[PDB]
Amino acid sequence: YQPTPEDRFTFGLWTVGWQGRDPFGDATRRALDPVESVRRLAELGAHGVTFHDDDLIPFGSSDSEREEHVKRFRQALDDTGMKVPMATTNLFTHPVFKDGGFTANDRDVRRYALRKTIRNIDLAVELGAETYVAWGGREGAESGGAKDVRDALDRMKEAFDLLGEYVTSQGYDIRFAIEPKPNEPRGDILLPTVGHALAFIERLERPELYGVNPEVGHEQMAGLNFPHGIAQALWAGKLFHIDLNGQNGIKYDQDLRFGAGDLRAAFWLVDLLESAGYSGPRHFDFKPPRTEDFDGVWASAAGCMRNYLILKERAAAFRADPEVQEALRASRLDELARPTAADGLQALLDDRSAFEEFDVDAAAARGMAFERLDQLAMDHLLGAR
Amino acid sequence: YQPTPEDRFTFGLWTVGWQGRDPFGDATRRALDPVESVRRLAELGAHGVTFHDDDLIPFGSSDSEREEHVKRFRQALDDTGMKVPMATTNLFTHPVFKDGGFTANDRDVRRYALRKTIRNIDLAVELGAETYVAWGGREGAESGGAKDVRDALDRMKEAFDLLGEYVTSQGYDIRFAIEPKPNEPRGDILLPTVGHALAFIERLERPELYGVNPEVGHEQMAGLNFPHGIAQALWAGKLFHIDLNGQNGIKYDQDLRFGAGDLRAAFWLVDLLESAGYSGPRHFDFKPPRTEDFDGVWASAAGCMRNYLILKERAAAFRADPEVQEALRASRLDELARPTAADGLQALLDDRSAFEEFDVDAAAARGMAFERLDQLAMDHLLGAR
Amino acid sequence: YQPTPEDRFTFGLWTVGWQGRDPFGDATRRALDPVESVRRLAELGAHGVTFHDDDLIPFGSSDSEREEHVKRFRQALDDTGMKVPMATTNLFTHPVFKDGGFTANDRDVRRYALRKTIRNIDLAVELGAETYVAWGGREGAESGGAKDVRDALDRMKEAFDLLGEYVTSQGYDIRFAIEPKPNEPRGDILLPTVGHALAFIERLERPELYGVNPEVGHEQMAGLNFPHGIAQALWAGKLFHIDLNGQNGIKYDQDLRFGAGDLRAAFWLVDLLESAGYSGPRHFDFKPPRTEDFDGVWASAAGCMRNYLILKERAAAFRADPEVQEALRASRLDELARPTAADGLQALLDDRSAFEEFDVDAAAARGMAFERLDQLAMDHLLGAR
Amino acid sequence: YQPTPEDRFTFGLWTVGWQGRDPFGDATRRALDPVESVRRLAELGAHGVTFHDDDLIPFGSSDSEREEHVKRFRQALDDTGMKVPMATTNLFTHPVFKDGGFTANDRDVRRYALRKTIRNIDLAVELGAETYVAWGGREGAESGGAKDVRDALDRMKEAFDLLGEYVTSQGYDIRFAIEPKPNEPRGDILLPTVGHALAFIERLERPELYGVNPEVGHEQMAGLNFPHGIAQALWAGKLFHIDLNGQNGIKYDQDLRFGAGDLRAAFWLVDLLESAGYSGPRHFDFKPPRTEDFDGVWASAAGCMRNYLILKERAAAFRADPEVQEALRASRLDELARPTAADGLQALLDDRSAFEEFDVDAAAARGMAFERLDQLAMDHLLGAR
């Protein structure tokens, strides 16, 4: 179960670089230089890394320091063959973003947020990123009268429209991906789920430039089924990127390593990506727990990759088993794929076998045989066939 | 706080008519005749009622019995002046719908479901309903391999497209409203939230015919902010109807009377509907608890109405208070309503006050004064001004 | 992975006998005769069955019909070698229990509830049950003013004290087990968790007669860690029985087969029971989903058993691996088992190495190596060693 | 609604002193000197303050600096008449406590934790505190194999036993209060709820010295009913202190001002404390949101107090209304307070009216009239009588 760069595994600098500060505790680890993270990830078999502007260039850096930070990063990429497929902006840490970036009540803040983003899109393109993520962590409220949501969505739409006009004007080959989350750090965050982000996109001036970057733990914080949310994004043709991690239910965002948290959900996710032929990066947005030292950091990052490869093997064995293919037919998955009324509305209306002469009792008595199917899936996941 | 028909309060027959059967207990009340519900609601000040096909005409009724059930209902409407603004289909109770209606794996079931719906649309129009609701309570799964979601969404789209072709062909003046719910009775239900339903609509053949019918308790079962979800639907121009009730957090669907559950959320909802000028029915989808007799039923239905009118008064007092209008300006709600960059992209790019010369520290130090605003809202709700 | 009666697997009659009625749907299966369930379970390798009074003898049965129901049951037990290790009372289905049994506001109801229970304790003893379970599903409220909790706990204590006086007076060899649940069917249920039940026991007249019967899905409906709750019950010496099933988070009670739901939690539970030497029945309180026919029922019941045996094998392989034993020492599990200050308070107070000369920085820098340990556990569960 | 010191309102230094650092953002406010907090709270009408050792004396302070910090604090108390009714220890912030204090795997850590606590008990007594709180925020785990819970509870018991031996030996007049929380910052925390803490106490060497300090938001993070949990603690005679705040459901700990979050729950809590004659401090453990400046801090602290006094007035009006007293009798709250069988077991057994001749149907048909009662409570809370 050894990863290789062909597996397309990616990590954010902020993941293995998290120092361990939480709401109740100080850092337990020293800061990592981005150059060291690049080398250590390459050695483990990763394909590439991602960054927020502030992870690479310290907030308030002069143009000089900015250039120095970039050249050193670029050298590490050349030395290792590591790529940078995605980048994003930090519109959450600095106190000026306390009420949001794109939807802050103060207009001056809103203009500042757009300028900070634009500057990072230029860098992203230079580094060859294909996707630019937006996670609006501060866009939201703790109280009802603090934010008029209709006005807030108008401001959010205005922000994304301007960003689309910018990339178009520049002739850049980059697409945007909105990353939803239901709460934390704000009491409620705008565009809380995959569904809300999808619906919003459809009201932008050039919808083709925007998709979603869903995260396992985010949808789970609302108690939702992650693989179902992913299938809806695929169905809409909007899965531009994905963030993998673990979460144990509805509580604070834990960001466990991928595989931890809801293991069966992880199995069904892998099945789906591999089946649908998803060809983007397999990105890990996680935090090695603050109980660990540096050895523990690298062990947790390696586990992310190892769990995906184990699940891949098991899902493929499941789909290739003749006994499973038979079970799928027993549960009528084949019939779910056929059109309900390719014959058309008139034909359906005239068809007595669809109503007047439909035997409801006989249909009702047919078992779906879902429990035998699910046990085959359990046996495969556990390697107990 | 006396309701009148001009308040547009409506109730489903299945609400005050719920007999009290739950997963662990038998009925505690006898069945109510729809004619009696119509008269008792009219006396309390309701404007109208709604129904599922099966609430009015017992499943498996001959055409004769069907006609008799309708004429008796129609007489009660004429006697009382009660209207029927919405109707829906029961695609959940009968065992044949155990794996869904529109997205059942069995194709024959799927065709049956469409025929049962069509028959009810005709009735709805005859009764003068303006909105037809679809709640797909059985569309979903308990296990991962039982339903291919991509195929399921193709079948769901096919169903709604055929329904749109039908109403168009007939020349009917009716629109559809999809009612989301995250779980219960299925382990996970497809189109779980307001957001997922909005996104789906945009992929139908004639999106203009479809909106949402959100329910307070449904979004709360995912831990989401109901007033925020409503504002997104209004922003999209898709709030065709609304279901009011109460829910105490993330647990089974309680369907308490409106006002019970999350009271502050109810306050912010009323504020929003009244402010935005929502002109549809104020519909109550609730269940008088099984602890009550008939007197308790009517007391609970009356409380639904009374709580909405109390909240209306308080929200209006809040918005009309000079001290609140001042607080809104103090928290920059006025600035949230102004365009970020009406000057355009070039202008923004050239503006040094937006970045190069933006004083981030001064901006950061400005308090938002949200806590004083929220206490004014608390004082108003409690009548403690 | 074939079960045998020596594995101590037990099932309630109400499990494989659930007809499939839910809050939104009619039954999908016909009723099963208890005699048939006994034979079919024996064939699958079960050790025994359990019952509520009403599962075996229909409510309102004459003494004659009662005797007939018992003798037929007893014959099936003799024919198969099946045992009955636990029984309970139905104080939830009948409308008279709408506000509770032991804590109903009406005193007459409360006296009725005690009499119905006593009659079943006699039957239980005759059948050789060792444990009598109490699940107070209707003890609770939907509204704040409906129940004074202090008074309700006085009534609950009075009920259990009388039951203890009864068994003592009769000379019966039976112990009681309280089964907690946080909600459903009541808005809130009294004694919501394992912790609340443990605390209550300590205020009864003869605490030695009472323990807990925790259920996987029940603690998960509060988002709690099931294996941690079990360890506290074991620590107190109160784990008299256990109910196994599956649940996907905080939502309605799903009662999935054991192994489904939170698989890692199931792994850690098995580890704990086997390690601690729990010697009671492994009881399954679950419901085959309403999508299944009879073949699906028996497949789901067999899966319960199969998953426990797979998990048992994996947990035992984990604990026996030399590499894991080393990892446990690396994470200082050995030191967690040693007394903090066997030297005593004075010694601790005088020890400079415990404070004045304690090197906090050196201690802080020591990694706990928990992530490597957890990956060994993942590898073992998945059979990927 | 003006508070006075006779209202017994108290605040932790860490509340109004929270700088606004969260998992995703830097501080938005400067640090407050404890002396300034004391004066500003006194001016608002507070009765007193509480502290963790580290809030008053910076970690690693020399004995000299320690004395200076104390004398300055003591002067502010004398100048204002403010009292200090409770104190606690910080066993969570410093990296050395990354795996816990009392239940850290490393034995040396465990001994350090006890010494740090003891030193603070001495200070607490000198300042005249009556209650010493223990919140074990780091006692727990993110993974199953990292902590053996049975061993962890043995270590927790050992810690509290030593603390009880210490206060006894010293002749101190102080009692301990354990403050439960279900998660955050650890994936799962030991003693997660009020129930688990109550059960644990009963296994300590001198149970009379220990009670609970429950917090509104903590029980709500498990979806539990706070007023019900409080009634159980009162029933056991263990409510030594209480922490008031607000929380909007199952998510991260928000620590909103009291009154915000679940308003009806706040109403029922006030009713209960006032009815039961709770005479301890009304302590606020909350955080003014990071969106606020100093003016916003003091406005939020004042709102805590104002909401309690409004709720007090409304609950008292509710209980004093003749119409409510009648409703309580209609719902049989009077009968819930009478013994079920003061006549004894024999009498109950011989009573035919309790079973043989009990009319179950007549009893079942009696409505509980809970909905009318709950609407009277709503009308009172809203001042709409």
Ligand SMILES: O=C[C@H](O)[C@@H](O)[C@H](O)CO
């Ligand atoms: O909740 C935080 C997000 O997951 C963050 O990692 C985004 O991906 C980056 O802005």
Ligand SMILES: O=C[C@H](O)[C@@H](O)[C@H](O)CO
């Ligand atoms: O969860 C059930 C729904 O709320 C139901 O009332 C729909 O509105 C009608 O099909």
Ligand SMILES: O=C[C@H](O)[C@@H](O)[C@H](O)CO
């Ligand atoms: O939630 C219902 C319970 O789990 C039930 O099965 C009890 O065990 C029997 O009274």
Ligand SMILES: O=C[C@H](O)[C@@H](O)[C@H](O)CO
């Ligand atoms: O969750 C944190 C606690 O509520 C904290 O305030 C304790 O009261 C103090 O140790």
Ligand SMILES: [Mg+2]
């Ligand atoms: Mg996250």
Ligand SMILES: [Mg+2]
């Ligand atoms: Mg992310």
Ligand SMILES: [Mg+2]
């Ligand atoms: Mg509902």
Ligand SMILES: [Mg+2]
């Ligand atoms: Mg509804």
Ligand SMILES: [Mg+2]
């Ligand atoms: Mg259950």
Ligand SMILES: [Mg+2]
């Ligand atoms: Mg059970």
Ligand SMILES: [Mg+2]
């Ligand atoms: Mg807290």
Ligand SMILES: [Mg+2]
């Ligand atoms: Mg606290």
